[PDB]
Amino acid sequence: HRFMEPYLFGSRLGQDIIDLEQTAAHLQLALNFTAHVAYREGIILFVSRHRQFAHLIETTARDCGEYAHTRYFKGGLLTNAPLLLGPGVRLPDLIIFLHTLNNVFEPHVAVRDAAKMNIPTVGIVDTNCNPALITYPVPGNDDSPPAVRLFCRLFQVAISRAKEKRRQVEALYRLQG
Amino acid sequence: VESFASMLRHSPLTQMGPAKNKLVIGQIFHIVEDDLYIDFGGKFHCVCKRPEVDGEKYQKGTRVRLRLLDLELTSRFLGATTDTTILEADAVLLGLQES
Amino acid sequence: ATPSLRGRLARLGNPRRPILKPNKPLILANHVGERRREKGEATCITEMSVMMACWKQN
Amino acid sequence: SNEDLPVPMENPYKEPLKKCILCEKHVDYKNVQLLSQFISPFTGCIYGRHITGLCGKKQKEITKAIKRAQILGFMPVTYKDPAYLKDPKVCNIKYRE
Amino acid sequence: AGSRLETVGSIFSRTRDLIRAGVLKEKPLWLDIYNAFPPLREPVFRRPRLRYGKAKAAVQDIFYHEDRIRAKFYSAYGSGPKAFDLFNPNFKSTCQRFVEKYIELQRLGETDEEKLFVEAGKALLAEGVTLRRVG
Amino acid sequence: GKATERADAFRKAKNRAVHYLHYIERYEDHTIYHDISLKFKRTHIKMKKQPRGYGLHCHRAIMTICRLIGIKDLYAKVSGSVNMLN
RNA sequence: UGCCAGCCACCGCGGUCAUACGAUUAACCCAAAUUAAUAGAUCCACGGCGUAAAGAGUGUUUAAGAAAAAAAAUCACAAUAGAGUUAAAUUAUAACUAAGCUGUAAAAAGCCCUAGUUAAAAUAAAAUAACCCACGAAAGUGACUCUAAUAAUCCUGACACACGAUAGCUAGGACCCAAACUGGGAUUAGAUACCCCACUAUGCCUAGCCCUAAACCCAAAUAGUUACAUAACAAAACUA
RNA sequence: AAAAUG
Numbered sequence: 038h039r040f041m042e043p044y045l046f047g048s049r050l051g052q053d054i055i056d057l058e059q060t061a062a063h064l065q066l067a068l069n070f071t072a073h074v075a076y077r078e079g080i081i082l083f084v085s086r087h088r089q090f091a092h093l094i095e096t097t098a099r100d101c102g103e104y105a106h107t108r109y110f111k112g113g114l115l116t117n118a119p120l121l122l123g124p125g126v127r128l129p130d131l132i133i134f135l136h137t138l139n140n141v142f143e144p145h146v147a148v149r150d151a152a153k154m155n156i157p158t159v160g161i162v163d164t165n166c167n168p169a170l171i172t173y174p175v176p177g178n179d180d181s182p183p184a185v186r187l188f189c190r191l192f193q194v195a196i197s198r199a200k201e202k203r204r205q206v207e208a209l210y211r212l213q214g
Numbered sequence: 215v216e217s218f219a220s221m222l223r224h225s226p227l228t229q230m231g232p233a234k235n236k237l238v239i240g241q242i243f244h245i246v247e248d249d250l251y252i253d254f255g256g257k258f259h260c261v262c263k264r265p266e267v268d269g270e271k272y273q274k275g276t277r278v279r280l281r282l283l284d285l286e287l288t289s290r291f292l293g294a295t296t297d298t299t300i301l302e303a304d305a306v307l308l309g310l311q312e313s
Numbered sequence: 314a315t316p317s318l319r320g321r322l323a324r325l326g327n328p329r330r331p332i333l334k335p336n337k338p339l340i341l342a343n344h345v346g347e348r349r350r351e352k353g354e355a356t357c358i359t360e361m362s363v364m365m366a367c368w369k370q371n
Numbered sequence: 372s373n374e375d376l377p378v379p380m381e382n383p384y385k386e387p388l389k390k391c392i393l394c395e396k397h398v399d400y401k402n403v404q405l406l407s408q409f410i411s412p413f414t415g416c417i418y419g420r421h422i423t424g425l426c427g428k429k430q431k432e433i434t435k436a437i438k439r440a441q442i443l444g445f446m447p448v449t450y451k452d453p454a455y456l457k458d459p460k461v462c463n464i465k466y467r468e
Numbered sequence: 469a470g471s472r473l474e475t476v477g478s479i480f481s482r483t484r485d486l487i488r489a490g491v492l493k494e495k496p497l498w499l500d501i502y503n504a505f506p507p508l509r510e511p512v513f514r515r516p517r518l519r520y521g522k523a524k525a526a527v528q529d530i531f532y533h534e535d536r537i538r539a540k541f542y543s544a545y546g547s548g549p550k551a552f553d554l555f556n557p558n559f560k561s562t563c564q565r566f567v568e569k570y571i572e573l574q575r576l577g578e579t580d581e582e583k584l585f586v587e588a589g590k591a592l593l594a595e596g597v598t599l600r601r602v603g
Numbered sequence: 604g605k606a607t608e609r610a611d612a613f614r615k616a617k618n619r620a621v622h623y624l625h626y627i628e629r630y631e632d633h634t635i636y637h638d639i640s641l642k643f644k645r646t647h648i649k650m651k652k653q654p655r656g657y658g659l660h661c662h663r664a665i666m667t668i669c670r671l672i673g674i675k676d677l678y679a680k681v682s683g684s685v686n687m688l689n
Numbered sequence: 690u691g692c693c694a695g696c697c698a699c700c701g702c703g704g705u706c707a708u709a710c711g712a713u714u715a716a717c718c719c720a721a722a723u724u725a726a727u728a729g730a731u732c733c734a735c736g737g738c739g740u741a742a743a744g745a746g747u748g749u750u751u752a753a754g755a756a757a758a759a760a761a762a763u764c765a766c767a768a769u770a771g772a773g774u775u776a777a778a779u780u781a782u783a784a785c786u787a788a789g790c791u792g793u794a795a796a797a798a799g800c801c802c803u804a805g806u807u808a809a810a811a812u813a814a815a816a817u818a819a820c821c822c823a824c825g826a827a828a829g830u831g832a833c834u835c836u837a838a839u840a841a842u843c844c845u846g847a848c849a850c851a852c853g854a855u856a857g858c859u860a861g862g863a864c865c866c867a868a869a870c871u872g873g874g875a876u877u878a879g880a881u882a883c884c885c886c887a888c889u890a891u892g893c894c895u896a897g898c899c900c901u902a903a904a905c906c907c908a909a910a911u912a913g914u915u916a917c918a919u920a921a922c923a924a925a926a927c928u929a
Numbered sequence: 930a931a932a933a934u935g
């Protein structure tokens with residue numbers, strides 16, 4: 038993509054290599070932002086349209102206690118919330134993209150709808166992705182099983198620590214008086 | 215603290231250079247009735263045909279030898295702004311961890 | 314091998330006379346054309362002829 | 372200060388370019404045996420690039436040589452000479468299936 | 469209610485200005501975290517315009533000095549008998565052994581390419597790897 | 604808002620205009636920060652920063668829009684197409 | 690009253706259906722002034738030229754203008770003008786065989802000095818190569834060989850100079866084949882058309898004119914940039 | 930092949 042030029046280290050015989058210095062620099066902020074929303078009782082949803090690891094995304098989300106969407110994204114899901122989901126619902130406060138592109142190789146619906154509804158989006162963007170709309174983009178690899186498992190485990194522990202430390206903070210709040 | 219330039223210079227993929235006609239070890243992680251999904255480990259997973267000799271010996275987790283042809287099959291077509299990604303790699307089967 | 318396309322169409326950057334003049338833009342579509350059904354033809358006119366030869370002779 | 376940074380130098384893995392069968396060769400109008408391999412044995416047409424597989428210069432040169440030899444009195448136009456009919460097949464066209 | 473405009477700017481600006489004007493009377497929870505830890509680039513929409521003319525991308529190809537030796541090794545003997553193991557992080561290949569011999573032969577004050585090549589090829593026999601030259 | 608009935612179109616426009624809200628930076632809450640010369644599809648707009656005593660000498664629609672926004676002092680000239688949407 | 694009477698600056702209104710015609714009431718704006726007409730002031734482009742009006746058919750040059758930072762000039766292939774040659778087909782012309790040949794959806798007309806095969810000058814044109822993209826300023830050029838040869842140490846520039854497809858004119862020559870026009874035969878109510886046959890001007894060479902094209906790639910020339918930025922379609926938007 | 934008008 039034209040917008041991945043600053044996020045790349047170079048090109049190894051046609052194949053572009055993403056430098057991991059800015060990847061880690063972005064991932065620190067990404068995990069911190071993801072953990073803070075979970076700490077402040079926020080709804081976190083893992084959007085990912087990729088028919089290889091979708092089962093792993095629902096397993097990770099269920100273990101985290103957050104919500105997931107790996108199936109076909111309907112039209113007015115995030116915009117027409119009072120109709121698609123229920124009379125009055127709570128919009129997800131954070132959207133995690135593990136695969137910003139769908140099976141058509143087009144930008145996802147949710148990355149546009151989150152920007153429309155002022156919903157923070159943290160996303161793993163590949164060399165063919167568009168990071169202009171993602172609030173917290175992390176340049177990485179989303180097609181490697183080890184890379185996606187690493188990202189899923191990192192986002193699992195980021196939520197787990199946030200929730201647990203919220204519980205001990207509330208426990209100390211109870212002892213405060 | 216080790217720097218990415220330093221570890222990338224010593225990465226095995228850097229040592230391999232071009233991926234044309236290179237012998238690699240891969241491990242099968244998925245099995246279809248006749249297609250074997252072999253992860254040689256570079257970026258993507260190649261798909262191969264089950265041979266006629268010792269066909270029952272190919273199971274999930276088996277290590278095999280591949281002659282890599284291309285890391286990622288992409289090409290340009292008429293009126294296309296970017297390539298058409300196949301999300302796969304090109305490789306052929308030679309043996310199964312001859313040791 | 315695919316025929317070359319450089320310097321064929323009429324563009325601002327093309328200095329020479331256009332070579333190819335497309336009826337429709339050369340954009341590869343997402344669907345192929347439906348297969349054509351073959352036109353039928355009469356059968357065994359040859360054997361009908363030898364059938365009628367008996368009738369004309371006998 | 373990093374000594375492991377990539378250096379901007381020419382590609383070492385640059386494979387040599389493919390050559391036409393007659394790169395750095397001499398095409399002549401008197402070599403009917405050579406000119407006959409690029410013409411059809413039954414009709415006498417001159418094969419194109421997609422059939423012969425020659426880079427841009429030698430295709431025009433072989434065409435000019437055939438056209439010159441056909442009028443100077445060295446090669447027949449309508450057919451390929453049966454004496455040179457048994458030459459090795461260089462063209463990529465297959466008639467009998 | 470809110471602002472559903474994407475091309476105007478980023479989400480943080482469209483929430484902050486709405487609250488400053490007084491339309492959005494409720495602070496979203498993520499605004500405080502954005503203020504505390506902002507990202508590197510503001511999430512403003514930028515249209516991917518095509519690049520015409522003589523302009524070219526600014527990415528530079530990754531090439532080192534060891535690639536010159538690896539090209540000679542692959543041109544002479546091709547792929548090594550020891551197949552490449554990409555799972556091992558500390559895996560050293562036959563070409564890696566060849567280039568490690570080449571660098572030390574260079575440090576030994578040898579400037580001739582033939583001397584740097586054939587001597588390394590013979591030295592590999594001391595460790596006992598088989599070289600298959602391609603004719 | 605577009606509908607078969609005029610009242611329905613009015614209601615649709617009212618309910619759909621709130622969802623798309625801009626914020627206009629107004630210098631000292633009466634005039635824009637700097638003169639703006641903008642080229643839209645086919646409509647040219649030239650707007651110049653104006654003093655406190657020059658109240659909304661603009662087009663008859665720009666005056667209404669700026670009255671809704673909060674701009675009290677402005678001068679605007681529109682050239683080319685005068686299409687309302689553009 | 691009902692496309693009648695009539696009204697209007699533009700749109701336009703007149704249906705036993707008029708807030709637009711005529712009258713009444715009511716209302717609005719001016720005011721000793723109010724309307725109508727004619728003159729004025731102001732109003733066109735520091736904008737554009739692919740599809741709406743616009744890039745002139747081409748090159749050179751005079752006058753005139755910009756030289757604002759630095760670089761360059763010249764190579765396979767069908768530029769052009771002369772001279773020579775012809776591989777396939779076609780035909781004038783002879784010999785054997787047949788009574789048919791050509792013709793269309795079907796026919797008719799025409800030719801039976803016809804048709805097939807074997808030999809054959811002259812004229813015209815130059816399969817495949819060409820899925821190539823070169824030459825020439827443009828028009829234009831691709832069967833072969835030879836000679837001459839393709840300006841500028843390279844900005845723009847006319848009403849001046851030189852070219853300028855086909856069509857048409859004059860004189861001489863050529864005429865296989867194609868064909869305006871014309872004469873027959875089909876179809877049609879008509880067919881002075883599309884369909885079939887024959888033939889003339891013409892297409893061919895030399896010399897002299899004519900100076901026109903959807904001469905269009907509807908995108909002017911010279912050096913550039915991918916910055917801002919999609920009226921629509923189309924070949925993306927732009928600078929000096 | 931054929932074939933007009935409102």
Ligand SMILES: [Mg+2]
Nearest residue numbers: 163164179180
């Ligand atoms: Mg990817």
Ligand SMILES: [Mg+2]
Nearest residue numbers: 328329330825
């Ligand atoms: Mg030219």
Ligand SMILES: [Mg+2]
Nearest residue numbers: 334335336337
């Ligand atoms: Mg068209």
Ligand SMILES: [Mg+2]
Nearest residue numbers: 336337338342
């Ligand atoms: Mg079509």
Ligand SMILES: [Mg+2]
Nearest residue numbers: 683684685686
């Ligand atoms: Mg108007």
Ligand SMILES: [Mg+2]
Nearest residue numbers: 696697709710
């Ligand atoms: Mg009146």
Ligand SMILES: [Mg+2]
Nearest residue numbers: 696697698709
């Ligand atoms: Mg009136």
Ligand SMILES: [Mg+2]
Nearest residue numbers: 709710711712
């Ligand atoms: Mg009245």
Ligand SMILES: [Mg+2]
Nearest residue numbers: 733734736737
């Ligand atoms: Mg005008």
Ligand SMILES: [Mg+2]
Nearest residue numbers: 738742743907
């Ligand atoms: Mg015009």
Ligand SMILES: [Mg+2]
Nearest residue numbers: 744746905909
């Ligand atoms: Mg022109």
Ligand SMILES: [Mg+2]
Nearest residue numbers: 745746902904
């Ligand atoms: Mg003209």
Ligand SMILES: [Mg+2]
Nearest residue numbers: 770771894895
């Ligand atoms: Mg002449």
Ligand SMILES: [Mg+2]
Nearest residue numbers: 780781811812
């Ligand atoms: Mg004659």
Ligand SMILES: [Mg+2]
Nearest residue numbers: 797798799800
């Ligand atoms: Mg007759």
Ligand SMILES: [Mg+2]
Nearest residue numbers: 814815816832
């Ligand atoms: Mg020819």
